[PDB]
Structure 1
Amino acid sequence: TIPHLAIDPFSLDFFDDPYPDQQTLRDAGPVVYLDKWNVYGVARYAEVHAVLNDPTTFCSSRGVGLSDFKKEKPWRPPSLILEADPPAHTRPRAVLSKVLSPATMKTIRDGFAAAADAKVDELLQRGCIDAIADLAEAYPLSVFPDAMGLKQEGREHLLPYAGLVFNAFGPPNELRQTAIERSAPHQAYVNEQCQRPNLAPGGFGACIHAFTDTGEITPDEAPLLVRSLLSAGLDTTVNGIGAAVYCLARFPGELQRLRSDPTLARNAFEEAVRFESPVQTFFRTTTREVELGGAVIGEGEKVLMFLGSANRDPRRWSDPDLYDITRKTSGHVGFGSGVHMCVGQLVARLEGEVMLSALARKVAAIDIDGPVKRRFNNTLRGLESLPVKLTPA
């Protein structure tokens, strides 16, 4: 009843061009079985959305990577938020919601916008730049570590640590194995920065520790919650901004519309998140036998959700393979959906908005002018290098 497919969604060939295989996954049925990894897969919008919104049946506390925490030891102590189910999830989630709230956004927006404008002005002086290293990476590195309250020394560990976290959700392939082999210095740096004395006053880290006296979290929970922001808060935005710049570089008609109405910046970023889905996949584990799309999945089974495929499913989206900055994007699953839906999404959208606003106001054209190189990661989709020429407005 359930079709069995040999597609490896964690192979380099799949990462290089996932779209044909994602269509094969959607069109084979609402639920597939991936023989390569012994997991169920859901690639259509409807089933991905259904799984995300039933956390009781499709739990996160057995891991949101391939590994089942009931069977194997987690590679690092479980996240108190991403790898927790209600009710244990609820209070840590509330703390991060308040740390990354609107009032916080108001406190950081002017500095984030000024750093975005300054980066674009700097890049325009060079003209020909790498939109990954010099923009997608450089801009978040210029705002987010400071907003966390990290010291300067050791920040070179942040992107390697995040690449490790995202590779570690994958199966035990070479990408995952190599990341874990190299992990010790990055883990040691990150864990140390999570301690209260190492987080500067007023930043996100200090604010997490300050919530340890309200009864929502205890002091011994704060370091791991800081760890969540140092895991999820940087490389995601690198790949979100990279996705948006890559979309504007490939679709100059949309850059032209954005230049003509810079207030489209927020939706242009949201549409890049749908179109590229920087976070491609996450797993859940069934807690009982369950019927999903006419299929019967037993207890204790891993279910792989293809967020990027759900975001391009023609059953849900008109012209899904077109980048359209005025698209009604509400309901895309690039930030997840339901109780675990990205708690940092206001930070991500702020960074994306102010960078796209700076481009919309300062840049007339973005032309690819060198070889594009893709970066391979078991969970993140994005580029290693994007050579572009920026023409000033």
Structure 2
Amino acid sequence: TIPHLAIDPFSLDFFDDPYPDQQTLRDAGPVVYLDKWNVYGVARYAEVHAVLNDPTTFCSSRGVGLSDFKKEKPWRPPSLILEADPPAHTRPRAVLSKVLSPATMKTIRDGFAAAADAKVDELLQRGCIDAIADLAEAYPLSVFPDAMGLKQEGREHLLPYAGLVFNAFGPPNELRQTAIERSAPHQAYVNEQCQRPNLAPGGFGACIHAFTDTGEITPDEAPLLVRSLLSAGLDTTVNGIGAAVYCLARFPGELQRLRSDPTLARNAFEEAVRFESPVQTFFRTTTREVELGGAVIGEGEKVLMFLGSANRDPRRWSDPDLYDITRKTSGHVGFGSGVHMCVGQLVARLEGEVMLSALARKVAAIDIDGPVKRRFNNTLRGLESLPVKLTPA
């Protein structure tokens, strides 16, 4: 028998402090039923990992938000990668893998690192800054749109579009309905930038279009694949870098360890991804009756995976509520797991690494010096404002 809970994981109260409710979800059983939204939930590491790694049973082509594409129209044409199952998923995924490949990181690393150092130097001249607007947002905005090959005009639509995408995975609450109400201009801008003539040579977008002659994707698939990078590629890194800075601000002992060995920068960022889990949740839809954690789930049911809870499950992690930059982080699910595991993770890690390297080399202290304000989104966890004073090294 499955426990029924009234917790709303998409309520502002939950977003404001999810950790007690996440423990309640884990401790109630391996599988729960959320009466508020008529979905199954899994919050322990073991079940989240199992669901992610059985894409045949727990599919993505019926949507990875609450909405079931077999019942309702998607709010935008489905993603060819996120909202596809194998085998249709496989070739688009291979293209994005090569576009965002280990070999590709070599071409952009020097520029990304220089921009990170420059940003930290600029911020140190001001001393008192907002680590969200002035750092977590400003740094990705200074590198990623250019790496995509976007023109300058209209970039102000990118963060609003991403906020809309991530709110739209949620249930039809006020956050989602308001986002969709305001979406038209952001949708129009993003769709237009996905066309081949609008993407500058050598950038990620042009490279996607260049793959349309190998037989992996056709020309009419390239715009939606560019759309995937313009959906997932910016706001995630904003909240990842914001999480890392928030962690270093709250845990000065870890900033001190990072300063003493800047080569810990990449793992410090990975640990921030585990600790905050910027992408909190995704859904799957069952394609058959299935037994999961001793429970029987029928066909066509939505299953909500709590990635952030899995990343704090004491059944899997020692001292899960501690930020530890030398933790063995391998196996966290902050980037997912299995066939859909974040195809952009090398870009995310590159940005996080070079930013934390710049802080490690240039900053002696990060002190919160103003009211912290949280940003509410149905899928993303992060801050609206993080006033800090940076002391130079």
- Given the two structures, how large is their TM-score scaled by the length of structure 2? 1.00
Q: CA separation in 2, counterparts of 1:103 and 1:186?
A: 32
Q: How does 1:212-251 map to 2 (within 5 A)?
A: 212-251=212-251
Q: Which runs of 4+ in 1 moved over 6 A?
A: none
Q: CA separation in 1, counterparts of 2:198 and 2:241?
A: 28
Q: CA separation in 1, counterparts of 2:92 and 2:315?
A: 35
TM-aligned CA deviation for residue 281 of structure 1: 0.0
Q: Unmatched 5+ residue regions in structure 2?
A: none
TM-aligned CA deviation for residue 128 of structure 1: 0.1
Q: CA separation in 2, counterparts of 1:72 and 1:205?
A: 30
C-alpha deviations, 1:256-306, integer Å up to 9, x for none? 000000000000000000000000000000000000000000000000000
TM-aligned CA deviation for residue 379 of structure 1: 0.0
Q: CA separation in 1, counterparts of 2:132 and 2:201?
A: 31
Structure 1 partner of 2:258:
258
TM-aligned CA deviation for residue 103 of structure 1: 1.3
Match status 1:31 vs 2:3: no
Identity over aligned pairs, percent: 100
TM-aligned CA deviation for residue 75 of structure 1: 0.1
Q: CA separation in 2, counterparts of 1:197 and 1:114?
A: 29
Q: CA separation in 2, counterparts of 1:209 and 1:103?
A: 18
TM-aligned CA deviation for residue 102 of structure 1: 1.1
Q: CA separation in 1, counterparts of 2:347 and 2:271?
A: 16
TM-aligned CA deviation for residue 368 of structure 1: 0.0
Structure 2 partner of 1:380:
380
TM-aligned CA deviation for residue 194 of structure 1: 0.0
TM-aligned CA deviation for residue 186 of structure 1: 0.0
Secondary structure class of the residue paired with 1:328 = coil
C-alpha deviations, 1:149-177, integer Å up to 9, x for none? 00000000000000000000000000000
Structure 2 partner of 1:389:
389
TM-aligned CA deviation for residue 222 of structure 1: 0.0
- Given the two structures, how large is their TM-score scaled by the length of structure 1? 1.00
Secondary structure class of the residue paired with 1:374 = strand
Q: CA separation in 1, counterparts of 2:335 and 2:54?
A: 16
Q: CA separation in 2, counterparts of 1:218 and 1:280?
A: 33
Secondary structure class of the residue paired with 2:146 = helix
Secondary structure class of the residue paired with 1:337 = coil
Q: CA separation in 1, counterparts of 2:290 and 2:70?
A: 19
Match status 1:19 vs 2:40: no
Secondary structure class of the residue paired with 2:365 = strand
C-alpha deviations, 1:117-136, integer Å up to 9, x for none? 00000000000000000000
Structure 1 partner of 2:315:
315
TM-aligned CA deviation for residue 43 of structure 1: 0.0
TM-aligned CA deviation for residue 384 of structure 1: 0.0
Q: Unmatched 5+ residue regions in structure 1?
A: none
Match status 1:305 vs 2:305: yes
C-alpha deviations, 1:203-250, integer Å up to 9, x for none? 000000000000000000000000000000000000000000000000
Secondary structure class of the residue paired with 2:367 = strand
Q: CA separation in 1, counterparts of 2:101 and 2:197?
A: 23
TM-aligned CA deviation for residue 189 of structure 1: 0.0
